[PDB]
Subunit: 213 residues, 4 copies
């Protein structure tokens, strides 16, 4: 309960204050994050734990099914601030196998308001219908999870924010990853782009190397 959490915070804080009174000293030392993590609200496994990144190195955004919608100002505001103000060098979009958002999109359950958000994933399911169709029933949702991350990476790269940052020569690299709850091992979908040209090439080869695998 809320009481338990409050208790935890107290103890947790107390402990650190003693053992490592410097812990809060480091944090007090303004360290601009160098990475922007865009993941799902499910947050099955915190980004910090998966990567060993320490708090302060990560600027974070989370929504249902880790989407980067062309016109979602919430995510775009996070991206623009991180890129233009914090000047992060890396942006990572991470999905996860078994994601409830991804599943709900396909198993179209009348969940309410949230379904509108999920229609963006449904567009993807239909876009890659042949590929998804030509494969085992049990492999489709996971493949869709990967297709989603790749499509969002593509959207991120085409945002005016990224196009303008690359055009002016700023150094920003975007990545697309995914992981399962059975080992928490990150899988690089290999759609890493450092400019507008590689974005296209990596998108193309990524989608095609799935049809081959």
């Amino acid at each position: 309960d809320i009481d338990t959490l409050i208790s935890n915070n107290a103890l947790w804080s107390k402990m650190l204050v003693e053992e490592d009174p410097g812990f809060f000293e480091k944090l007090a030392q303004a360290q601009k994050p160098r990475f922007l993590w865009i993941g799902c609200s499910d947050s099955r496994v915190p980004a910090e734990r998966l990567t060993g990144l320490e708090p302060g190195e990560l600027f974070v955004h989370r929504n249902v099914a880790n989407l980067v919608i062309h016109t979602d100002l919430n995510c775009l505001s996070v991206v623009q601030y991180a890129v233009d103000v914090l000047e992060v060098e890396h942006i990572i979009i991470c999905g996860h196998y078994g994601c409830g958002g991804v599943q709900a999109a396909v198993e179209n359950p009348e969940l309410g308001l949230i379904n509108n958000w999920l229609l963006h994933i449904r567009d993807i399911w239909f876009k890659h219908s042949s590929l998804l169709g030509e494969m085992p029933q049990e492999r489709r949702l996971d493949t869709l999870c990967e297709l989603n991350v790749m499509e969002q990476v593509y959207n991120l790269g085409h945002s005016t924010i990224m196009q303008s940052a690359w055009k002016r020569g700023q150094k920003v690299t975007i990545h697309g990853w995914a992981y399962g709850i059975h080992d928490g091992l990150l899988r690089d979908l290999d759609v890493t782009a450092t400019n507008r040209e590689t974005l296209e090439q990596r998108y193309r080869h990524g989608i095609s190397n799935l049809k081959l695998k």
Copy 2:
């Protein structure tokens, strides 16, 4: 740390667990709906998992700049609706933190670009409480605004059709407004906890009143 470093940490981290504690992945595999929805800032100075001492999978999370719950932001509203109507979280926490770069930039409109539009929502608050903040010892305004902001977002959340509907349906959901600083990482309950429509209107005023009289 370059990308390859992060991937290296994960590989090793996962290997040790797989061996050392396979139980970790079993707990995770066990589909247990989150009970809390955390709405924090993208700055994420101290991860909510650390702060609350919760295990992964116990929290449904949403993060945006300066932790806002804008009346018409479908991103945050969709997270909320899914959590409440689908995952049925019992608690929703909006947590801010003193020193937030968003809150600061909002009052110092540094011409940061696109992000400024999002921050005008904090500026509205800065002006709304101009007297309370004007009678403030300057160097204590940004921290106050930080708390004022959290309270306003809690207010907006309680007023969302999502929340009004849930409460009317008689569903058990409590919303909280917290804050903490990076000197102790200690959470301060802003005393704006609401469990229904009535409590919402009251606790809200009796949350702002505190500061304007203390």
Copy 3:
């Protein structure tokens, strides 16, 4: 100038007050609109003029390139109010040939913020690349204008707002139209749907009857 407009309003009002003092009396007579028109901000030719509809019969929404984005709360709020509150019986999405939004999307000119909005049209251009590709250069933009309207109609029909209204049995029909500035003659794209089932069928046959024509 602003002065001219103000002058016009005065005269226009004065005139009517005399000739037809009842004009404002009818308006004063609360007449819930029966149609919702969703068109482009260009508004080359006002909806009222194209259809002969009189003010008050039309509830209206306008954005660049007449889009109905899965997650655009502005348009969705107009739709939900019109459907659930005003109970309009008809919703019409109307595009127009030569639309600057449609052209800008393809001729990808770095126009600023607006380009993010237009990425939704670009998705369509690429979705129907084969069809568009297998046709005259001069016919592509106009065809894209039509494809856009059909895709937005499809989006509208899949919104939770429409799905829930149809499921509960409310009578709502959605249409997709377009017109050119050379004759202002409305062309029915024929994707009219009265329920969730006809929506799918009309979408399918509409897209396919274009490839044939």
Copy 4:
């Protein structure tokens, strides 16, 4: 009127023009950028073309419920940005109208569903001016709110990065706040016209002050 009726009107209407006045389509064919951006309500009780007496193609238009210019609404902001930076409109008009169903529903929160979230933005205003409206003769509040709303949206527009940037670039753009009623269809300039950042802050207060002292 059923759909087929509307299509019939168009067919006939177009035929007569094609014959009677072919010049109409020539004027239209002549690409002449709009000079005004009109932001009105979806109610559209009286089309702006009628109100201003403008020809088609002279106005770039945007309509939403209760004519709002929300800080973070990308729909309206994209229309604005395109009009200002691309079409280079010289004037932007935000026009409200007394009796607006959105303004009314906002203060009477009838549990209309999704639309209520959008209307919370008007409610914020209703509360913001609680005294001015509290010292109002009740039956005159909704019309006041209507005007207050327009002024607030004009304020939000002037503060958008889009507008701030344009003005800083030294681009000539003027924003206006109007309103009218369906008894005379006469436009009332709410006196909140702004041509730059300075004028914006001033005219804004000197627009609200009028009402709170008159």
